[PDB]
């Protein structure tokens, strides 16, 4: 036991352009995730949380994940999706979830959907969608960024049939380097560019929401395989900064910064983060889509 | 029951003009007869610490259901046969799991058991020295000894025993207080100045703050205001098209905005440039360190 502990929310920054009233906000709490016959697996000490949320006029939205102990389970999931019982078990308690517990509507955040289950993935949220609309519950869903349909671990992502199902779409647009590859910036603002007009020829624009980076990256240079890069926060990236006394310097073409440093055994280190600049791009390109939000990450201790 | 917990940790970011660092991991609690009543699934992490070349901390609270206990605390500094116990136990903690040392952060201490604290922490770091592991201790920051609700932590005392010193040199503005800035240089010079006078200057690192908070201005005292992160507030601020604004004085960063329910809001945080100018003083003043937050969820 352990009464320090971080919970995870997403929580959305809407669009200044576009504002009893309805709600203009959410926060999506992590998780619950699901058993291979569609159960919901785990419950949570959620029932300060969503009270809280609701008297602050935001949408409380249960998070609803395929994780396991050792992360995403792409195996999980896949036998949910092709179980007709089994999805319409979760179906059935996802509903339950959202009526006992008092949410306004989940977040679907399942990843690592194998690109055979593209259809079943679509189909099932359509047959969550009915489900939940019925009752006045709001249907969104975590997506990794697309740009196109060419890529194996992202063609379980129908952008256009999903974009037709849910309320919401909030796009993770992150990672185009991460952890265990080689160094370079999170969310590019090219990358970003491509993700949103692949989108928008798909989905509607007041449904999409662009989710920011949740970690910055510190990797070792002359980069070695294997290895693994220290997953931090942009704070913890400006703190590395202070402490090595390294400058921060910007990237034109991808409006990201960066620095870099050698450590007190002489390895060169490269760091690639999110700061002020960065984070007001991607509010920028929000506003120049005419998109509904950015999304974002806040850590609540209870 | 849940697979995305936030691990807490608070590490050390060395003065530069010193050219070894630290990870203090949260927590184990402590129950009245001084045992230690939790376990951690930590040997990951040790491990993975270990390895980056920095050391692993046990932190050890007097933390409960509802906060930090007085009471257990309380109990355990009077009764010698529980103070031992709990020296013990901490003792047997770090060598079995492969700790390189302790942090201490026992909060709400009582006035009375002052010296009381000051002798458990000399009778710790006897028996944690003799197998070669560090003592630490986090600590709330003092710009005096006069103010008698933290008056229980001796900074002279406790400095000539422990090793290093954490000094939490935040929320002098917090969640149920009026609006202003978390750790303003002002009181983070004064704080350096007692500090020093009393403790060597090796000893001592200042913790930086984890949190903003968001005031609801013309503020009515009950109410609590929003902990959010420094992150969270730039967020805020593009959300609401706010300007950051920058205290010369405090050397703190703030903004001001309008919600959608036509209140006003107030907000203080720590920015880069008031980042900056902490590690400054700990330069100024060739202090160890800046202390901060580190999240891992796992």
Known sequence: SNYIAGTLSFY????????????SSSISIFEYHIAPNGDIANQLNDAAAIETTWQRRVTPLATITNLTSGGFSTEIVHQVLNNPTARTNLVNNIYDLVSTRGYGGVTIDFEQVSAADRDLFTGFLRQLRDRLQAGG???????????????????????????????????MAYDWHHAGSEPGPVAPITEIRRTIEFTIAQVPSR??????????????????????????SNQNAIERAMRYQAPIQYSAEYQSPFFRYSDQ???????????????????????????????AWQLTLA
């Open 12 to 23: 959305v920054l809407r669009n200044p352009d576009l504002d009893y009233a309805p709600y």
């Open 137 to 171: 519950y709001v249907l969104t869903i975590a997506v990794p960024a697309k740009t196109s349909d060419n890529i194996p671990w992202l063609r379980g992502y129908d952008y256009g049939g999903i974009g037709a199902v849910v309320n919401y779409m909030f796009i």
């Open 207 to 232: 449904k999409i929401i662009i989710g920011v980076p949740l970690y910055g990256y510190d990797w070792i240079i002359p980069y070695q395989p294997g290895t693994v890069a220290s997953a931090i």
């Open 265 to 295: 055994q002489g390895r060169t280190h490269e760091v690639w983060f999110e700061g002020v600049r960065s984070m007001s791009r991607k509010m920028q390109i929000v506003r120049e889509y005419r998109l509904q939000a950015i999304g």
